[PDB]
Design a binder for this molecule. Sequence first.
Ligand SMILES: [K+]
Ligand SMILES: [K+]
Ligand SMILES: [K+]
Length: 149
Amino acid sequence: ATWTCINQQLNPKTNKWEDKRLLYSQAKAESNSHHAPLSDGKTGSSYPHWFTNGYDGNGKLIKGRTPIKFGKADCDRPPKHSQNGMGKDDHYLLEFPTFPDGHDYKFDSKKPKEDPGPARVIYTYPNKVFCGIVAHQRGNQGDLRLCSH
RNA sequence: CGCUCCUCAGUACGAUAGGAACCGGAGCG
Ligand SMILES: [K+]
Ligand SMILES: [K+]
Ligand SMILES: [K+]
């Protein structure tokens, strides 16, 4: 499967934000999630880490929030995320940088830290069930929204 | 006392997608 994200990027010459169509291979994104550690933070880059998808640790939805519908029961279930995100009963979503070229993000480096880019592969803790590809609409900041596939 | 860098630490904390400080190290005023 191929996922497409439209990410606005600032063209210097026109000083205006333009739509860049970015394509991701699900197979490569999944491989990225397997190469990354099964932890929540605790790495030099901070990734991978808990993706709340609008909930708090007790599966309670933050008011005025619509979680992303992934289409897989495991991915759409309200999460159970304890303090360290390592409880022996936890189940929640993790986000990790993913790129069109498929390379593995250098999760262990803090200084300098690799640019995570606009996209993330979202997968479950602790079985790493693939959920989807999400990305920032503008540059590398703001909320993350589900890309198409 | 103030400012820059390291470290503390991607820790504490946070959930608008981020993120300290004390102690300690190196400087300038
Ligand atoms: K954390
Ligand atoms: K400091
Ligand atoms: K100090």
